[PDB]
């Protein structure tokens, strides 16, 4: 009586029932479940997530080298969430946030709750009190690395020179997740890479439903003079869709994730926009000869690149 595929399913089902939808899943599988998500502001990355954005009520971690593009995405999330009429809280602990830029990304700073904790404990706690209030859609934390314990913030000797930070970070998540689910608020934990872990990413890794690995990969020289930098995000972990997908998206200086950029990329691979010979075209239209000229084309003739986005939106989701 051995039938693998029938015996496998029964097992898989059990596996999912004992540990939750997504415990295990074939890699090239398509997903009925839409969740309800917060657009990552990166169409590519969105598809890359397989639900069109950051799932809600889950602990997300966006890690990666400095200036890779983590924040911007975390900020875009916020902005979107707020358009959907959601309230957002920024548990700042690095003091870098540029509200100005943030508004340019569409964030409504004036309605954005900001907190700058005195300690790691406080920082996580303050965020917990807010989470379980239920009034939030998304709550971003800046720099897991900065969630330094109190005994360390205050002057405490190199005795009980423990593995204390990550501890703090586990207990805090052990209880904040439960509420995030009940609350359905999405927690984006920005965790940045170092010197020479993060002493606190050890816990996260296991408590995060989604873990994006943000990376810098190119300087958009364009007309041989800097505009912005191209980014690549790997979805190393996804418990709401098949993991390991990949997306690339532009981020010009001063500007956030380039919509037209996205369009001209996703367009090409998905072939609605056919072009090569170092030139670009759509439905026979002369877009221009460099990704930039094109980006600009779309940026200007708003009408086009709208039917494209459309055309692309259809074929995917
Ligand atoms: N305050 C700013 N002013 C101008 N450009 C910015 C600013 N912050 C971010 N950017 C742009 O957004 C990109 C990503 O920034 P950011 O997300 O802060 O890097 P990180 O990965 O350390 O969080 C930067 O490379 C730059 O192109």
From Swiss-Prot:
Binding positions (ATP): 67-72, 98-101
UniProt-listed CDD domains: RecA
Signal peptide boundaries: none
UniProt GO cellular component terms: cytosol
Keywords per UniProt: ATP-binding, Cytoplasm, DNA damage, DNA recombination, DNA repair, DNA-binding, Nucleotide-binding, SOS response
Phenotype upon gene inactivation: Not essential in the absence of DNA damage, its deletion renders cells much more sensitive to DNA damaging agents such as UV light, ionizing radiation, alkylating agents and DNA gyrase inhibitors and desiccation-induced DSBs. 5-fold decrease in survival, loss of HR, no change in NHEJ (non-homologous end-joining) or single-strand annealing DSB repair.
Molecular function GO terms recorded: ATP binding; ATP hydrolysis activity; ATP-dependent DNA damage sensor activity; damaged DNA binding; single-stranded DNA binding
Highest taxon, organism lineage: Bacteria
InterPro entries: AAA+_ATPase (IPR003593), DNA_recomb/repair_RecA (IPR013765), DNA_recomb/repair_RecA_CS (IPR020584), P-loop_NTPase (IPR027417), RecA-like_C (IPR049261), RecA-like_N (IPR049428), RecA_ATP-bd (IPR020588), RecA_C_sf (IPR023400)
Keyword DNA repair set for record: yes
GO BP annotation list: DNA recombination; DNA repair; SOS response
Pfam families to which the protein is assigned, alphabetical: RecA (PF00154), RecA_C (PF21096)
Binding site for phosphate: 67-71, 192
Location in or out of the cell: Cytoplasm
Biological role: Required for homologous recombination (HR) and the bypass of mutagenic DNA lesions (double strand breaks, DSB) by the SOS response. Can catalyze the hydrolysis of ATP in the presence of single-stranded DNA, the ATP-dependent uptake of single-stranded DNA by duplex DNA, and the ATP-dependent hybridization of homologous single-stranded DNAs. Numerous X-ray crystals have been resolved under different conditions which indicate the flexibility of the protein, essential to its function.
Protein family per UniProt: Belongs to the RecA family.
HAMAP family (UniProt xref): RecA
UniProt subunit comment: Polymerizes non-specifically on ssDNA to form filaments. Interacts with and activates LexA leading to autocatalytic cleavage of LexA, which derepresses the SOS regulon and activates DNA repair.
NCBIfam families (alphabetical): tigrfam_recA (TIGR02012)
UniProt protein name: Protein RecA
Provenance organism: Mycolicibacterium smegmatis (strain ATCC 700084 / mc(2)155)
């Amino acid at each position: 009586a051995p039938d693998r595929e029938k015996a496998l399913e029964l097992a898989m089902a059990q596996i999912d029932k004992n540990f939750g939808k997504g415990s295990v899943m074939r890699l090239g599988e398509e997903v009925r479940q839409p969740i309800s998500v917060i657009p990552t502001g990166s169409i590519s990355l969105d598809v890359a997530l397989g639900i069109g954005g950051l799932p809600r009520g889950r602990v997300i971690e966006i890690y990666g080298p400095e200036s890779s593009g983590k924040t911007t995405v975390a900020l875009h999330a916020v902005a979107n969430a707020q358009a959907a009429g959601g309230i957002a809280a920024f548990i700042d602990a690095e003091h870098a946030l540029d509200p100005e830029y943030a508004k340019k990304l569409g964030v409504d700073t004036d309605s954005l709750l900001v907190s700058q904790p005195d300690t790691g404990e406080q920082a996580l706690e303050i965020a917990d009190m807010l989470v379980r209030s239920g009034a939030l859609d998304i709550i971003v934390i800046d720099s897991v690395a900065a969630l330094v314990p109190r005994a360390e913030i205050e002057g405490e000797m190199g005795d009980s020179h423990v593995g204390l930070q990550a501890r703090l970070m586990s207990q805090a998540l052990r209880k904040m997740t439960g509420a995030l689910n009940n609350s359905g608020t999405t927690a984006i934990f920005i965790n940045a890479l170092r010197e020479k872990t993060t002493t606190g990413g050890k816990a996260l890794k296991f408590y995060a439903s989604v873990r994006l690995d943000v990376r810098r990969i190119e300087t958009l020289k364009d007309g041989t003079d800097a505009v912005g930098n191209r980014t690549r995000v790997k979805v190393v972990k996804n418990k709401v869709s098949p993991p390991f997908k990949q997306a690339e998206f532009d981020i010009l200086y001063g500007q956030g994730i380039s919509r037209e950029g996205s369009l001209i990329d996703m367009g090409v691979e998905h072939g609605f926009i056919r072009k090569s010979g170092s030139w670009f075209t759509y439905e026979g239209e002369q877009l221009g000869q460099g990704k930039e000229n094109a980006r600009k084309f779309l940026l200007e003739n708003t009408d086009v690149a709208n039917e494209i986005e459309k055309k692309i939106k259809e074929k995917l989701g």
